[PDB]
Amino acid sequence: EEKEILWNEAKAFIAACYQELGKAAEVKDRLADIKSEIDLTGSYVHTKEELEHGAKMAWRNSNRCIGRLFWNSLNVIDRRDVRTKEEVRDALFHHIETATNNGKIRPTITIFPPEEKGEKQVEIWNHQLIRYAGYESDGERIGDPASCSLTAACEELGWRGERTDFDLLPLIFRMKGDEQPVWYELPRSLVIEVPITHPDIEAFSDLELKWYGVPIISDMKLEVGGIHYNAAPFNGWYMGTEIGARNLADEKRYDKLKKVASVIGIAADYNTDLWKDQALVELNKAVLHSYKKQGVSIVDHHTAASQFKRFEEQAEEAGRKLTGDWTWLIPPISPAATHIFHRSYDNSIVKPNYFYQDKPYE
Amino acid sequence: EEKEILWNEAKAFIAACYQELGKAAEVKDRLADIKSEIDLTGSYVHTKEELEHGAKMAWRNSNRCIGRLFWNSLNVIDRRDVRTKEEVRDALFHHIETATNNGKIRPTITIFPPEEKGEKQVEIWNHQLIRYAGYESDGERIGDPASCSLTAACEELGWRGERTDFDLLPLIFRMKGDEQPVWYELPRSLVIEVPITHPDIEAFSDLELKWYGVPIISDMKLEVGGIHYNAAPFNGWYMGTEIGARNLADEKRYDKLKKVASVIGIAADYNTDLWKDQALVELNKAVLHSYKKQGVSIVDHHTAASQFKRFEEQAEEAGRKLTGDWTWLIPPISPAATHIFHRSYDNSIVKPNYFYQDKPYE
Ligand code: HEM
Ligand code: HEM
Ligand SMILES: C[C@H](O)[C@H](O)[C@H]1CNc2nc(N)[nH]c(=O)c2N1
Ligand SMILES: C[C@H](O)[C@H](O)[C@H]1CNc2nc(N)[nH]c(=O)c2N1
Ligand SMILES: N=C(NCCC[C@@H](N)C(=O)O)N[N+](=O)[O-]
Ligand SMILES: N=C(NCCC[C@@H](N)C(=O)O)N[N+](=O)[O-]
Numbered sequence: 001e002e003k004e005i006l007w008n009e010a011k012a013f014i015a016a017c018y019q020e021l022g023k024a025a026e027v028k029d030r031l032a033d034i035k036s037e038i039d040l041t042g043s044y045v046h047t048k049e050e051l052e053h054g055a056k057m058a059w060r061n062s063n064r065c066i067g068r069l070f071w072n073s074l075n076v077i078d079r080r081d082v083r084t085k086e087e088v089r090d091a092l093f094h095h096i097e098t099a100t101n102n103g104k105i106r107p108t109i110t111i112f113p114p115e116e117k118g119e120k121q122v123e124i125w126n127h128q129l130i131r132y133a134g135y136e137s138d139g140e141r142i143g144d145p146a147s148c149s150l151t152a153a154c155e156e157l158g159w160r161g162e163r164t165d166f167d168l169l170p171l172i173f174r175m176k177g178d179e180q181p182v183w184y185e186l187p188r189s190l191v192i193e194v195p196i197t198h199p200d201i202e203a204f205s206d207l208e209l210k211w212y213g214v215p216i217i218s219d220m221k222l223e224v225g226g227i228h229y230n231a232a233p234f235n236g237w238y239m240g241t242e243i244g245a246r247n248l249a250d251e252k253r254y255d256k257l258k259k260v261a262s263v264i265g266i267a268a269d270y271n272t273d274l275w276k277d278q279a280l281v282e283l284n285k286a287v288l289h290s291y292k293k294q295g296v297s298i299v300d301h302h303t304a305a306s307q308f309k310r311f312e313e314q315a316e317e318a319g320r321k322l323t324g325d326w327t328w329l330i331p332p333i334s335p336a337a338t339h340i341f342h343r344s345y346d347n348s349i350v351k352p353n354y355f356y357q358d359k360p361y362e
Numbered sequence: 363e364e365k366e367i368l369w370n371e372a373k374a375f376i377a378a379c380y381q382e383l384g385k386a387a388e389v390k391d392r393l394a395d396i397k398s399e400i401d402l403t404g405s406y407v408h409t410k411e412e413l414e415h416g417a418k419m420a421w422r423n424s425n426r427c428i429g430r431l432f433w434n435s436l437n438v439i440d441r442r443d444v445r446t447k448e449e450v451r452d453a454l455f456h457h458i459e460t461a462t463n464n465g466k467i468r469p470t471i472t473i474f475p476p477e478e479k480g481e482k483q484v485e486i487w488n489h490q491l492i493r494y495a496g497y498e499s500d501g502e503r504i505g506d507p508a509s510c511s512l513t514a515a516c517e518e519l520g521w522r523g524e525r526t527d528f529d530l531l532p533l534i535f536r537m538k539g540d541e542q543p544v545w546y547e548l549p550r551s552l553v554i555e556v557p558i559t560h561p562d563i564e565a566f567s568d569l570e571l572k573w574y575g576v577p578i579i580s581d582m583k584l585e586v587g588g589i590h591y592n593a594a595p596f597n598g599w600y601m602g603t604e605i606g607a608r609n610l611a612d613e614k615r616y617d618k619l620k621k622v623a624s625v626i627g628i629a630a631d632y633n634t635d636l637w638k639d640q641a642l643v644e645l646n647k648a649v650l651h652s653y654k655k656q657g658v659s660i661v662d663h664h665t666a667a668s669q670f671k672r673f674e675e676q677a678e679e680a681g682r683k684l685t686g687d688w689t690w691l692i693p694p695i696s697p698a699a700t701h702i703f704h705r706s707y708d709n710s711i712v713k714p715n716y717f718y719q720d721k722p723y724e
Contacts, residue, residue, distance in 0.1 A: 245698055257699075271664040272650045274643055277696045281639045288634045302633040326689060332703070334639045336607055336694035337619075 013225030054224035153361035244284035375587030416586035515723035606646035663693035
């Protein structure tokens, strides 16, 4: 059954991929080669070109991503050669550096060796490569609540956070054959952070907010033609609402709207004053302003929706079905000011794609 | 088949209704009575208590409605006795008056005679009883674009609008046996309107915006125990976003955000300034302020979400399944500041309910 699942996904993927790459005449032979390899080895190995295009297809198929216009410019780093924890560590450092690119962020993915018998070669514990720790003890809340479980796991392993609201979590990952993960502090010189200021309201700096430059999701599985790349961190650049409307605003995250209201000089007493809405708009303005001022790439939700409209058009022109998850594509502020809110999307799963996987902590 | 559909819906409805009304021992006999009535007449007639509770259940089952906490306080007006166009007209005038209640809006439904062989007794053309006309000629756009088709239909029938941006459409409805609908101007003394001002920005009145007090959807079918009440106008009070974030803001409606930006003293040149978002917040503040100042009932989206949370709790406590359409329940501004955005809802259709029906114009 497992070989058949693999073989069927392989046929589907190779046909589509080679069709897109102008290589339809190479399909029959490549399929034959793959068939023998599966019989004899239990699996098969992608060519560099298959791996690159597969990672690109997987982004293009990601229903929850508004950023997909740029799917074909993904920089794919092939690290199927790594065997040691030092090499994994250095690959992850290099990903941060090359993706950051001094603020002119480059969409990048680093692909590590795939699972074999469902057996992981490298298992990355981080949710993102750069993320802030979170703590909750005797009612006292510090940092990012969404990080509490991973932070506790790290502190079981000998790491200790300074208990600032913005402690960088170490890289933490496990190698096949090791019972425990290892962890490494991130060099601060690798990590760009942006202090949050407002274009008009001087006092906004009194909040002492900041965020990191680059979101690098590091715990999703890339599936390509039946091969499971459980370790394949990727990044683009942020849409400003991710930071301003969710990370800094959610009651279960940094929960800053009351403090924002106070610094922008409005009362936070009556729902009818729409003070949360007003605070959200000013916080989201501050985020965009701050990243721009610092020369770190970011997109606003209006521009991002416009680009996504072009992605829809490009799909139709290419004769490809569009898939999307309306509930994630709408921005969390002024969604009805975008075209996305006014149409529907087919939420079917097409592969290659990126998938959730169970967290080894928790 | 049709009698069987009716009989099956009838059994389901009468059991549930009588169960909710403490009348479970009356079910068997009432079902027997209904069975004979269907055999002999082709249909059956609700008791006053069935009709009232059915209209209430239908609101409670309305997946797209955030306002459902108050389902049990609906004022049900039974107008199954009407036979003439004068009586329909007067019932609709009376609905407006009693629902408005000098601004202290009363949730009301007026139920007209049901369809017989799928044959409508009264067919109401209005989308809402109070609504503004819309015109589009040689590129020139006036009033509410969403009303263009109904406005044109009315002008085919001898009505003429003044071509203000806020012309009240006449009541327009057709009686069984008539080829054409009749229309009646609304008496202005029946219709409360609210001018839009802002609590702090004097110039906001320069926009000369207004809206009507009471939304009275008049083109949905109420289905209760297999009986089709195609003509059953209902109302609550507005949630402010309906007016501020959609009716006055949508590009395909009144399209006021650029004018709002200009009066509140902000540039509308760069997406990154989030000027649309800022304009939306100030317009929505103005709407709530204006209705409150005038003593006309309205709810903000934060309060409405809080009430809806209580509705969820009340359903679970009563042992009733909750249904909802997440995509309509989230408010169109700051949706992630509400609990609704952070959970999911079962979008199954439960009857009694309110349904769309085909428009006789168009
Ligand atoms: C180039 C700029 C990019 C932008 C502006 C962008 C924007 C977004 C946004 C706003 C989300 C929603 C995230 C949330 O609410 O937590 C998202 C989700 C996602 N994006 Fe992108 N994205 C970009 C690049 C990428 C890249 C390079 C990949 C993969 C190669 C990717 C794959 C995804 C996936 C898989 C999700 C779903 C994450 C989840 O379910 O938690 N995107 N994108
Ligand atoms: C008491 C105050 C009420 C509030 C604040 C409220 C709020 C809302 C809102 C905001 C919507 C979405 C409308 C849109 O986006 O166009 C809605 C839809 C709806 N409401 Fe309510 N509502 C209330 C009362 C009622 C009543 C009395 C009924 C029926 C008896 C009702 C039945 C519905 C239905 C059927 C829809 C769906 C309309 C459509 O699909 O176009 N609600 N409600
Ligand atoms: C097709 C698309 O889902 C559509 O724009 C919906 C979305 N959610 C909505 N929600 C509400 N309350 N009202 C609406 O008109 C809409 N429009
Ligand atoms: C369960 C519920 O649908 C959930 O809050 C979703 C809604 N839409 C979202 N959309 C985005 N982009 N990101 C999110 O975290 C969420 N959360
Ligand atoms: N933009 C991207 N978003 C995924 C980020 C999680 C995020 N919402 C947060 O950290 O706020 N990905 N990306 O660019 O690959
Ligand atoms: N609140 C209610 N909403 C239905 C209104 C249509 C509306 N969005 C508009 O006219 O803006 N109904 N209600 O209260 O019965």
